[PDB]
RNA sequence: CUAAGGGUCGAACGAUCAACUUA
RNA sequence: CGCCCGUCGCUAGUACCGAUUGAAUGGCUUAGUGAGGCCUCAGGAUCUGCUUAGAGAAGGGGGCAACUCCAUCUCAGAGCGGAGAAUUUGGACAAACUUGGUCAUUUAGAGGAACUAAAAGUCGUAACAAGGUUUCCGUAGGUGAACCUGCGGAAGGAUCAUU
RNA sequence: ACCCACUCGGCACCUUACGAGAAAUCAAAGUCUUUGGGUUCUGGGGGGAGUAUGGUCGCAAGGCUGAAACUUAAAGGAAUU
RNA sequence: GUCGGAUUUCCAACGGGGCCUUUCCUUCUGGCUAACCUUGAGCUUGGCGAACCAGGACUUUUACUUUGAAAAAAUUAGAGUGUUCAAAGCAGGCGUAUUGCUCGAAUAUAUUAGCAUGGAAUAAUAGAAUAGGAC
RNA sequence: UAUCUGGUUGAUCCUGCCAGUAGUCAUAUGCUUGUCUCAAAGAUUAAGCCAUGCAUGUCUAAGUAUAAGCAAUUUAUACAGUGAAACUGCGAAUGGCUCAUUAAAUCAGUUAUCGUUUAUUUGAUAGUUCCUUUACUACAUGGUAUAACUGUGGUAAUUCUAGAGCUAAUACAUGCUUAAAAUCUCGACCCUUUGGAAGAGAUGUAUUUAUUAGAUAAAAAAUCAAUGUCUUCGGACUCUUUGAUGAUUCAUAAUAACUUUUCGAAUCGCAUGGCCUUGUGCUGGCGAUGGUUCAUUCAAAUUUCUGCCCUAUCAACUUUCGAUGGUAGGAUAGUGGCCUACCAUGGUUUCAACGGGUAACGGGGAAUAAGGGUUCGAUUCCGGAGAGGGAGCCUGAGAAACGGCUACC
C-alpha cells in the first residue's frame, strides 16, 4: 500500500528484468495484460508501482468462466474483500420465491479502490486461497 | 444386471365395491356377453378410462395443434379400425361417448355368436 | 474408481446405436481411438445389427481376423474400433464401400459410395498450432495430424484428406453461404446453409443454419461440419438430405407408400 | 504420509468436517529435502505417471547467470546469507529457492578479463579489435564491481532444489542488490 | 543464536547511550 | 328417587423424583506409553570387477658357461571400485494400550409424591334450579375432603327497564 | 347560552337482513366453493397437562418456553320438546 | 375454376413487418458499397456501411415472459408393429418365393440453477440541482 | 375414474375425532392352489461370525527351450513342426457384493484446467550418441548372470525354502555404425587499415536456470554516433519478418550454461527379389515389438453457480496446537494453509451459522391421487464409501487395493 516493498523478500514482476546498463523509456519495465470481455485495465495498474502477483491485470492469474456481480460488505482484510450476492430461490410448493444471500470472498487489486457498499463485478479464476476464487475486474461507483 | 421387464395392471377395482345398482349392472353385462370373472369387466372399463383420459387431454388443446391432431387421428384411426366407432363418428367428441358395451361387442366371443356358429355365448 | 473402466452395461450405451435391452446386460464398449465412445460406432454392432452380415460375436471376430474390412485405408483388427463420423469402411469382398454418415432421424446410415468417393475423406480441423522445430500442423476431428498445412487454413474449417496418402488436397473456409452437417445434439443430422452467427466471446459459439425449406435452427459451433459451398456438396449426401419432416408429414409419406 | 487434501480442515464457517474418505494416494505429500552444501548426493523419488523427480541433498555446485552480461558460468557455492521466509535456513546454510547465496564468482572475473580486456578491482589484433569494439559497456554499477574485488558476488537461487535436483539462479544486480545489501548491513 | 520491549542530540532521516526482561 | 365432585382404603398398570461420589453400552477427546511401514545420518556383514605384487619351481627362445624373456598349482601385501542385507541416528504419518474428562443410549434402587383403569368401599354434598352461601378469573391464607374466606375483575347472572 | 340545516372525528343506539353464520346473533361476525387488499399471533378429539424435566427472570411467592408414557369413543357448541 | 379434393379480384377476421405524424430505436476503419442521384438506344459507369462481416466504443442493473441450444439411458405419456389376444418386446412387411426388395426402431414431458434469444406490461433500480449536467 | 357412510342426543343442526372403504415394484403370516408367459428373492434386527468347494490368469506366423515331453524332419547341420514348466511383457485397480460412515458432505444439473497426470489406442514425430571426437574402441556386432532343469536336502504343518552344477532373452548392465549446407564462437596470418582471413570448437532431443524475439490502428521533413544495400557516395531505397486466443510470462524460435545424463532400434516373423566392379560384394519388400515429443481418445484429480430430513428443551461458532487473508519457501502430477516461517485479526451467523438426532449413500425414479401435493427410494442405471475396526506402504499409468502385504485391537 504505502510502500511497494514492505516484506522480507523483494517484490518484483516474475521474469521481468530491467537492465542496469541502459536508460530506456519507462524506466522499470511493467508488464501488463488485458483481461478481456470488454474489461479495460485501470490506468493505476499501468503507471503504478504495486506488484500483486495475483492481480488480474499485472499478475499471472488467468480469468475464465463465470463473471458474477455483487455489493461489498467488508473491507477489513488485506487485498481481499467479501461480496454478498442476492438471489430468489423458487419453492415449487407455495408458488412463489424467497430471498437468499451468499457471501463470496473475492480478491481485489491495489489499483482499484473499493469501499463498503459498492456494487462490483468479479470474474472466476484459479483458486487463489482456501476460500477466495474470484477477482475484481471493474468497480461500478461514481 | 439385465434390464428389467415392464409389467402393468390392466384392471381397476371399483372405489365402491359394495353397491346393488352397480353389482346388478355388471352381472347383466357379464351374463349377456358370457364372461366368468367380473375382472374382465374391470379390465375393459380400465381401457375405456385410459382412452377417455387421453382423449380428454386432447380436447383442452386448440384446433390445428400438431400434438392434438397427430395423436387425435391416430387414436381415432385405431378406434374405427377395431370397430368400436363408426365411420361417421370420427370427430374426437364421440370418443368420450364410448361405453363398455360397445367395446364388449367387438370381442371375438360375441362375433362368433353374431355370425351364427355357437348358438350360445357359453358354447 | 482406482483407475480406468473397461465395461459398458447395456443400459448406458448411446441410444443411436439402436441396441436392445434383453440380449445380455453389457454393451460393446469401444476401445480408445480416433473418436469418442459416445460419438462413434463399434465395428461389431455395425456388422452384426446394421449390415446383418454377421450373426454372433465370433462371426464378427472371424470376419475381422480374415483381413476383409478396411477402415480409412487401414485394415484394422479390433472388434471395438470406434468408427465415427467421416469414416469409410472398404470391403474387398462383396465390392461395397460403406461411409458412416448420420441420418436425419438421429442415427448412423448404410450409405453406399463409389470407389472414387472412398478415396477422399472430409475432415474438420480443431486446432492449428506451431509445433516443435517450427513446423505447423492441423488437428482434424478424427485426430489425424497433418504437417505443413495451407496457411489459409484456420480453426473451424474443413479439409479434404486424401486418405491413401494422408495429405490435404482441398480446404473449405467457414463463412456465410456454406453447406454444413450438424454432428451432435438434438439437431444432429440436419443439412443447411449459414446466414449469420453471434460470436458471444464467453464460449459456445452459435450459428444460425437455415434448411433448404426455409427452416432455421440454432446449433453450437462445436457440432457443425462444413461439407461444401451453397448448392454444391463436396460429399454425396445421404437419402433425404436432412429435410426433417414433422410427424404429420412422415405419416402421410408412409400412407403414400404402403 | 503427509496429507494434501481439504477434508481434514475446518470449513469457512468454522464447522468441523467429518471423515469421508481414507487418505488417498493422489493427495500424498513427501518430506522436505533440506538441501545442504558439499558432497553432492542426489536421490530419486518415483512420482505419478513415471516422471522421476530428483530429490537433491547436499548440492556443492550450481549454475549462475549474469543477466546484464548475458552469460552463465558454473560456480561453487559457499553458504546463504539471507532468506526471506525463515532465518534458521540461513544459520543451517540450506539451499532453497529465493536464497541469497554468496558465490565463488571466479569464472565470471576470468570471463570479463578475457572478453572486454579489463580487470575488476585487484597483444593480438584479433583480441584487441573485440576489446575496442566491446568498449562503452565495460562499466558496471559500483556494488557489483566492489564485490568482484572481494572475489564474491551475491546471488539468488531461482531453481527449486528438491523438485528439480538442481539449484540455479542469478547474480543480484540493480535495486534487488541494493535492497538485500541493506538488510544484511542493517544494524 | 534469532526476534521483540528505549532515550537521545538534530520522505521521515542520520548519528549517540546504557538497561533489566519476554518469546 | 336425575346428574355429579374430592379426601381416605384395597387391586393392577404407566410415568416422575430419589441417597446409592449408581451401573452398563457407544461416540468424541487432554495427556502418558507408543508398535509398525516410509523418508533421512550412519552402519557394513557378504558377493564381485580393476591396478600393481614377490617367491617355492617346471616349459620353450636367446650369450649356449655364469645369465636373460613371459605364461604357470601356490601364497601374502597395497590400493582403484560396483552391487550390497542385518543393524542404526533424526524426522513426519501414526495403529494401539493406560489414565482421566466429556457426550449420548438403556437400567437397579429403600422411600416420597402423582396420573389412569378399577359393577355393588367409607365420609361429606362442592357444581348443574337463585343447587338452597349467584357462579366463574386472578392473588394470598386456612381447613380430613370436596372447599371456605379477604382484595380486585368478569357475566359465561338471577338485572338489556326509572327523564 | 339555545333553535334549525350541513359537515369531520367519536362512545354508542333503534329498525330491517341484501349478505354471513351450526344457531344464538352480526353494519360486521358482510363483500369466503362466483373462494386472492396488506400483515402478525394462535388451535388440530377429550384427559394426562400447562404436569415432569431442561433453560430463563425473580428476595421469595411465581412468570416465560414446554413434553412424553399411559388411558378413553366420545367430550364440547348453539337451539327444540 | 378437379372429379367427398382444390383456385383466381373478393365482401371478413386474425396474428406479423415497414413508414409517417415535433418520436436517434450507438457509429468509426474497411471492403459488398446497398436499396447504386448512377441511363449507354432500354437490363445502365460515380447515392448515406452492417441489410455481408473483421475490429475500438458507451455496452446503468435486474426480477418476469416467449423461443432456441441443454436436460445420458431406462422409466412416464405416446406413433407404428398380430408376443395368436394381453403383460411385453422393437420387432417386421412385401416379391416373378430359384435372383430378393424394403418402411421402421417415433415423438413428447423432464423441477430449480447455468447459456442465448424477441418483447416491453407488471414490480423495484441509478441518472442533471451549495450543476463536478449532455451535444 | 373432482363421490362417502356408521358412532355423542329423547330428538335436531354443527364442530370434532374414531371406525368403515380402495390402492401399494410395502413387507410378514394364515387358508387354498389346476395351466401359459414374465419374474423379485439374507436390505430392515447382526457392515454378526464362517467349515468346505470355486470366483483372473494369459500367446501368435512373429520374446526366450535340447522337457534327458510327443509325432514326423528327409524343404532345411543351429533350431527352424507341435509344445508342459519357467523367465519375460501385460492384466490382476475391471467386474461382483453391501449401504456401515457421511446432512454444502456425497450427489444432480451446469462451468473451468490460461491450474494437472494420463497406461492402452489413433495420427504424426529422432541423417547431428565414436567427446585431443587419427588407433582412444566388434559394429558383417560386445559383456554378465539367473529361472526352468540335474542332483543333495531340511520342517509335524505352509502356494514354506537352502547348498552345489549349467544354460537362455523384447532379462539386467554397456554400446558404435550415413550426406550436404547455415550461423554462433574462435582465431593462426596478410597486417593496405574499406579491412579480409587459413585453421579449430559447438549447434538433434530431454531436465533446470537467466536473457531476447514472439509484434505490427495513419501520412511527410532537419541533422547527426558510423556512408549500410549500389554508386553520377547528387542519393532511388522501396525490397524487409513471427501464428493463435475474449485474454497469458501461450504455442514456437534463437542465445549462455547446467545433467550424476533421458531418447535417438545390439528385438522378432514370413517371402526371399534386383545391380553388376561375377562377390557370403552392393541394394531390396510385407510386417510385429519397442522408443523421445506433440496432438487425440479411454480416463483420473481439483473446481464456478443453484439445490437436501427433523431440531433454537442447539444462539453464537472458529482461532490453544490453522482459524481469515497476505508475503516467501517446502510438498504435490498441478492451483490452494496442503504444510512451514513471519505479519495483519480476520471468516460464518435469526436470509436458521454452529451443535444434536436420523428406523439418512444421493439422484434417475416408485406408490398414491382432478389439479395442488404427500410418502418412499438398501434394491437391476449413474455418481460415491467399504472388504472386521483403524493406521502405513511396495509394485504399477492408474490402489492408499485387503479374493496385495506390514503393525495394533
Report the SS3 class of residue D85. coil
Between vectors from CA D63 to CA D178 and to CA D79, what angle results, nearest 5°?
A: 60
Q: A49 phi and psi, to 5 degrees?
A: -125, -5
Residue contact A19–D68, C-beta within 8 A: yes
Q: What is the C-alpha to C-alpha distance for residues D51 and D46, in angstroms, rounded to an integer?
A: 7
Return the exposure string of A49-79: e unless at least 16 CB atoms fall within 10 Å of the residue's CB, then b. ebbbebbbbbbebebeeebbebebeeeeeee
Q: Of C247, C246, C229, whose CA–CA distance to C192 is shortest?
A: C229
What lies within 8 Å, CB to CB, of A33 at 6+ separation is A41, A57, A58
Residues 195-214 of C with CB under 7 A from strand H: 195-200, 202, 204, 206
Separation in Å: I150 C1' and B62 CA: 97
Partners of residue C202 in chain A, C-beta under 8 Å: 37, 67
Task: Give the max Cα distance, chain B.
Answer: 53
Angstrom CA distances, D92 to C195, D34, D83, D153, stand at: 71, 10, 11, 20
- Asked if D touches B (at least 3 Cβ pairs < 8 angstroms), the answer reads no
Check whether residue D93 and residue D81 sit in a common domain: yes
Q: What is the C-alpha to C-alpha distance for residues D19 and A121, in angstroms, rounded to an integer?
A: 36
Burial of B1 (0-12, 13-18, 19+ CB in 10 A): exposed
Q: Of B105, B12, B98, whose CA–CA distance to B48 is shortest?
A: B98
Q: What is the C-alpha to C-alpha distance for residues D112 and D139, in angstroms, rounded to an integer?
A: 11
Q: Which residues pair with D56 in a beta bridge?
A: D42
Q: What is the resolution of this structure in A?
A: 3.2
What lies within 8 Å, CB to CB, of C65 at 6+ separation is C77
Report the SS3 class of residue D63. strand
Nearest protein residue to I39's C1' (by CA)?
Answer: B5
Query: Helix B20-33 to helix B39-59 angle, to the nearest 10 degrees?
Result: 100
Confirm or reject contact between A36 and chain C (CB < 8 A). yes
Check whether residue D73 and residue D143 sit in a common domain: no
Is residue C214 within 8 Å of C192, Cβ to Cβ? no
Is residue C179 within 8 Å of C229, Cβ to Cβ? yes
Quote the radius of gyration of chain C (alpha carbons, Å). 19
Supply the DSSP symbol for D174.
S
Q: What is the C-alpha to C-alpha distance for residues D161 and D169, in angstroms, rounded to an integer?
A: 11
What lies within 8 Å, CB to CB, of B123 at 6+ separation is none
Mutate: best of D7, D68, D89, partner A, most A CBs <10 A? D68
Q: After which residues is chain B broken (C to N over 2.5 A)?
A: none
CA distance between the termini of chain B: 47
Is residue B72 within 8 Å of B43, Cβ to Cβ? no
Q: What is the C-alpha to C-alpha distance for residues C160 and C86, in angstroms, rounded to an integer?
A: 11
Q: Of D155, D148, D146, whose CA–CA distance to D177 is shortest?
A: D155
Q: What is the C-alpha to C-alpha distance for residues A46 and A32, in angstroms, rounded to an integer?
A: 7
What lies within 8 Å, CB to CB, of C246 at 6+ separation is B66
Residue contact D84–A130, C-beta within 8 A: no
Per DSSP, which regions of chain D are E strands? 2-3, 28-29, 41-47, 50-57, 61-66, 71-82, 100-103, 155-157, 168-171
Task: Give the max Cα distance, chain A.
Answer: 75
- How many other CB atoms are there within 10 angstroms of residue C77's CB atom? 13
Partners of residue A36 in chain C, C-beta under 8 Å: 201
Q: What is the C-alpha to C-alpha distance for residues C147 and C143, in angstroms, rounded to an integer?
A: 13
A25: domain range? 1-142
Partners of residue A37 in chain C, C-beta under 8 Å: 201-202
Confirm or reject contact between B4 and chain C (CB < 8 A). no
What lies within 8 Å, CB to CB, of D121 at 6+ separation is D145, D146, D148, D149
Q: What is the C-alpha to C-alpha distance for residues D77 and D157, in angstroms, rounded to an integer?
A: 11
Q: Where are the domains of chain C?
A: 1-116, 121-171, 174-244
Distance from CA of B70 to the nearest CA of C (A): 6
Check whether residue D129 and residue D164 sit in a common domain: no
Report the SS3 class of residue D81. strand
Query: Helix B39-59 to helix B66-82 angle, to the nearest 10 degrees?
Result: 150
Q: What is the C-alpha to C-alpha distance for residues C128 and A93, in angstroms, rounded to an integer?
A: 52
Residues 81-120 of B with CB under 7 A from strand H: none
- How many other CB atoms are there within 10 angstroms of residue C30's CB atom? 28
Supply the DSSP symbol for B87.
G
Q: Which nucleotide is nearest to A4 (CA to C1')?
A: I327
Q: D109 phi and psi, to 5 degrees?
A: -65, -40
Domain count, chain A: 1
Q: Of C41, C185, C36, whose CA–CA distance to C110 is shortest?
A: C41
CA distance between the termini of chain A: 23
Separation in Å: I315 C1' and A116 CA: 27
Strand H–CB C187 distance below 7 A: yes
Report the SS3 class of residue B21. helix
Angstrom CA distances, D47 to C196, D25, D53, D90, stand at: 50, 11, 7, 30
Q: What is the C-alpha to C-alpha distance for residues C58 and C50, in angstroms, rounded to an integer?
A: 16
Residue contact D176–A12, C-beta within 8 A: yes
Q: What is the CATH number of the domain that holds D116?
A: 1.10.168.20
Query: Helix C247-255 to helix B66-82 angle, to the nearest 10 degrees?
Result: 40
Distance from CA of D59 to the nearest CA of A (A): 23
What lies within 8 Å, CB to CB, of D1 at 6+ separation is D28, D29, D30, D31
Q: What is the C-alpha to C-alpha distance for residues D71 and D58, in angstroms, rounded to an integer?
A: 25
* B neighbours by CB contacts (3+ pairs under 8 Å): C
Partners of residue D99 in chain A, C-beta under 8 Å: none
The DSSP bridge pattern shows strands D50-57 and D41-47 to be antiparallel
- How many other CB atoms are there within 10 angstroms of residue C9's CB atom? 14
Check whether residue D89 and residue D119 sit in a common domain: no
Is residue A106 within 8 Å of A82, Cβ to Cβ? yes
Q: What is the C-alpha to C-alpha distance for residues D26 and A117, in angstroms, rounded to an integer?
A: 43
Confirm or reject contact between B2 and chain C (CB < 8 A). yes
- How many other CB atoms are there within 10 angstroms of residue B112's CB atom? 14
Separation in Å: F132 C1' and A69 CA: 84
Domain count, chain D: 3
What lies within 8 Å, CB to CB, of A132 at 6+ separation is A80, A105, A106, A107
Q: Dihedral (C-alpha) A58, A64, A68, A71: value to the nearest 10 degrees?
A: -20
Give the rounded distance of the alpha carbon of D163 from its chain centre: 13
Q: Which residues pair with D64 in a beta bridge?
A: D73, D169
DSSP for chain C reads --S-----BTTTS-GGG---SSS-SB--PPPSSSS-GGGEE-HHHIIIIIS----SHHHHHHHHHTT-EEETTB----TT--EETTEEEEETGGGEEEEE---SSSS----EE-TTGGG-EEEEEEEEEE-GGG-EEEEETT--EEES--TT--TT-EEEE-SSS--EEEEE---SSEEEE--SSTTTT-EEEEEEEE--TTS--EEEEE-TTS-EEEEEGGG--EEEETTEESS-PPTT-S----HHHHHHHHHTT-
Is residue B50 within 8 Å of B20, Cβ to Cβ? no
Q: D168 phi and psi, to 5 degrees?
A: -120, 155
Is residue A123 within 8 Å of A63, Cβ to Cβ? yes
Q: What is the C-alpha to C-alpha distance for residues A20 and D142, in angstroms, rounded to an integer?
A: 11
Q: C221 is written with which cell numbers?
A: 459451433
Angstrom CA distances, A5 to A49, B7, D176, stand at: 10, 76, 11
Between vectors from CA D111 to CA D110 and to CA D117, what angle results, nearest 5°?
A: 90
D35: domain range? 31-105+152-187
Check whether residue D86 and residue D167 sit in a common domain: yes
Query: Helix D175-185 to helix D142-149 angle, to the nearest 10 degrees?
Result: 60
Check whether residue D41 and residue D77 sit in a common domain: yes
Is residue C141 within 8 Å of C123, Cβ to Cβ? yes
Q: Of D101, D90, D108, D118, whose CA–CA distance to D148 is shortest?
A: D108
Q: Of C91, C64, C94, C93, whose CA–CA distance to C80 is shortest?
A: C64
Check whether residue D96 and residue D114 sit in a common domain: no
Check whether residue D12 and residue D42 sit in a common domain: no
* D neighbours by CB contacts (3+ pairs under 8 Å): A
Q: What is the C-alpha to C-alpha distance for residues C240 and C253, in angstroms, rounded to an integer?
A: 12
Burial of C43 (0-12, 13-18, 19+ CB in 10 A): buried
Angstrom CA distances, C53 to C22, C46, C57, D68, D150, stand at: 21, 9, 11, 74, 88
Q: Of C225, C230, C155, whose CA–CA distance to C185 is shortest?
A: C225
Check whether residue D50 and residue D134 sit in a common domain: no
Q: A78 is written with which cell numbers?
A: 488485506
Separation in Å: F2 C1' and B109 CA: 73
Is residue B58 within 8 Å of B71, Cβ to Cβ? yes
Cell 547467470 belongs to residue: D65
Residues 134-153 of D with CB under 7 A from strand E: none
Amino acid at each position: 500500500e504505502l510502500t511497494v516493498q514492505s516484506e522480507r523478500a523483494f517484490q518484483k514482476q516474475p521474469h521481468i528484468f530491467n537492465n542496469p546498463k541502459v536508460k530506456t523509456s519507462k524506466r522499470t519495465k511493467r508488464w501488463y495484460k488485458n483481461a478481456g470481455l470488454g474489461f479495460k485495465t485501470p490506468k493505476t495498474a499501468i503507471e503504478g508501482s504495486y506488484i500483486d502477483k495475483k492481480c488480474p491485470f499485472t499478475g499471472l492469474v488467468s480469468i475464465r468462466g463465470k463473471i458474477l456481480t455483487g455489493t461489498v460488505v467488508s473491507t477489513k482484510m488485506h487485498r481481499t474483500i467479501v461480496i454478498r450476492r442476492a438471489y430468489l430461490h423458487y419453492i415449487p410448493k407455495y408458488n412463489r420465491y424467497e430471498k437468499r444471500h451468499k457471501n463470496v470472498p473475492v480478491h481485489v487489486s491495489p489499483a482499484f479502490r473499493v469501499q463498503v457498499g459498492d456494487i462490483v463485478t468479479v470474474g472466476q479464476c484459479r483458486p487463489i486461497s482456501k476460500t477466495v476464487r474470484f477477482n475484481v475486474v471493474k468497480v461500478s461507483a461514481a | 444386471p439385465r434390464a428389467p421387464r415392464t409389467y402393468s395392471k390392466t384392471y381397476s377395482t371399483p372405489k365402491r365395491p359394495y353397491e346393488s345398482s352397480r353389482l346388478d349392472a355388471e352381472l347383466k353385462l357379464a351374463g349377456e356377453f358370457g364372461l366368468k370373472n367380473k375382472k374382465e369387466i374391470y379390465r375393459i372399463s380400465f381401457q375405456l378410462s385410459k382412452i377417455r383420459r387421453a382423449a380428454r387431454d386432447l380436447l383442452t388443446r386448440d384446433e390445428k395443434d400438431p400434438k392434438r391432431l397427430f395423436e387425435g387421428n391416430a387414436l381415432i384411426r385405431r378406434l374405427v379400425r377395431v370397430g368400436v366407432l363408426s365411420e361417421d363418428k370420427k370427430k374426437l367428441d364421440y370418443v368420450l361417448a364410448l361405453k363398455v358395451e360397445d367395446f364388449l361387442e367387438r370381442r371375438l366371443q360375441t362375433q362368433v355368436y353374431k355370425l351364427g356358429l355357437a348358438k350360445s355365448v357359453h358354447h | 474408481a482406482r483407475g480406468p473402466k473397461k465395461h459398458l452395461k447395456r443400459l448406458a450405451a448411446p441410444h443411436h446405436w439402436l441396441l436392445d435391452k434383453l440380449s445380455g446386460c453389457y454393451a460393446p464398449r469401444p476401445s480408445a481411438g480416433p473418436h469418442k465412445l459416445r460419438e462413434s460406432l463399434p465395428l461389431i454392432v455395425f456388422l452384426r445389427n446394421r449390415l446383418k452380415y454377421a450373426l454372433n460375436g465370433r462371426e464378427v471376430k472371424a470376419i475381422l481376423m480374415q483381413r476383409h474390412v478396411k477402415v480409412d485405408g487401414k485394415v484394422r483388427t479390433d472388434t471395438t474400433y470406434p468408427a465415427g463420423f467421416m469414416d469409410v469402411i472398404t470391403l474387398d469382398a462383396t465390392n461395397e464401400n460403406f461411409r458412416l454418415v448420420y441420418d436425419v432421424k438421429g442415427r448412423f446410415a448404410v450409405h453406399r459410395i463409389t470407389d472414387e468417393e472412398a478415396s477422399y475423406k472430409l475432415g474438420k480441423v480443431k486446432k492449428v498450432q506451431l509445433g516443435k522445430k517450427g513446423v505447423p500442423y492441423v488437428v482434424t476431428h478424427d485426430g489425424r495430424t497433418i504437417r505443413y498445412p495451407d496457411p489459409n487454413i484456420k480453426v473451424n474449417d474443413t479439409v479434404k484428406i486424401d486418405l491413401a496418402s494422408g495429405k490435404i488436397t482441398d480446404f473449405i473456409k467457414f463463412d456465410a453461404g456454406k453447406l454444413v452437417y450438424v454432428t451432435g445434439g438434438r439437431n444432429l443430422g440436419r443439412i443447411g446453409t449459414i446466414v449469420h452467427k453471434e460470436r458471444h466471446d464467453g464460449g459456445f459459439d452459435l450459428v444460425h443454419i437455415k434448411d433448404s425449406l426455409d427452416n432455421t435452427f440454432v446449433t453450437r459451433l462445436n457440432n457443425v461440419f462444413v461439407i461444401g459451398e451453397q448448392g454444391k456438396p463436396y460429399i454425396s449426401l445421404p437419402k433425404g438430405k436432412g429435410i426433417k419432416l414433422s410427424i404429420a408429414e412422415e405419416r402421410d409419406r408412409r400412407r403414400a407408400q404402403q | 504420509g503427509i496429507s494434501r487434501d481439504s477434508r481434514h480442515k475446518r470449513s469457512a464457517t468454522g464447522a468441523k468436517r467429518a471423515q469421508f474418505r481414507k487418505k488417498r494416494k493422489f493427495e500424498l505429500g513427501r518430506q522436505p529435502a533440506n538441501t545442504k552444501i558439499g558432497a553432492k548426493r542426489i536421490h530419486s523419488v518415483r512420482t505419478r505417471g513415471g516422471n522421476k523427480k530428483y530429490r537433491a541433498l547436499r548440492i556443492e555446485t550450481g549454475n549462475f547467470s549474469w543477466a546484464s552480461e548475458g552469460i552463465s558460468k558454473k560456480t561453487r557455492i559457499a553458504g546463504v546469507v539471507y532468506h526471506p521466509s525463515n532465518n534458521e535456513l540461513v544459520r543451517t546454510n540450506t539451499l532453497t529457492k529465493a536464497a541469497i547465496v554468496q558465490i565463488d564468482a571466479t569464472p565470471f572475473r576470468q570471463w570479463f578479463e578475457a572478453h572486454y580486456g579489463q580487470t575488476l578491482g585487484k597483444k593480438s589484433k584479433n583480441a584487441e579489435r573485440k576489446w575496442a569494439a566491446r568498449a562503452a559497456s565495460a562499466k558496471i554499477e559500483s556494488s557489483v564491481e566492489s564485490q568482484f574485488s572481494a572475489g564474491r558476488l551475491y546471488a539468488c537461487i531461482s531453481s527449486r532444489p528438491g523438485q528439480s535436483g538442481r539449484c540455479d539462479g542469478y547474480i543480484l544486480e540493480g535495486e534487488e542488490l541494493a535492497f538485500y545489501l541493506r538488510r544484511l548491513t542493517a544494524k
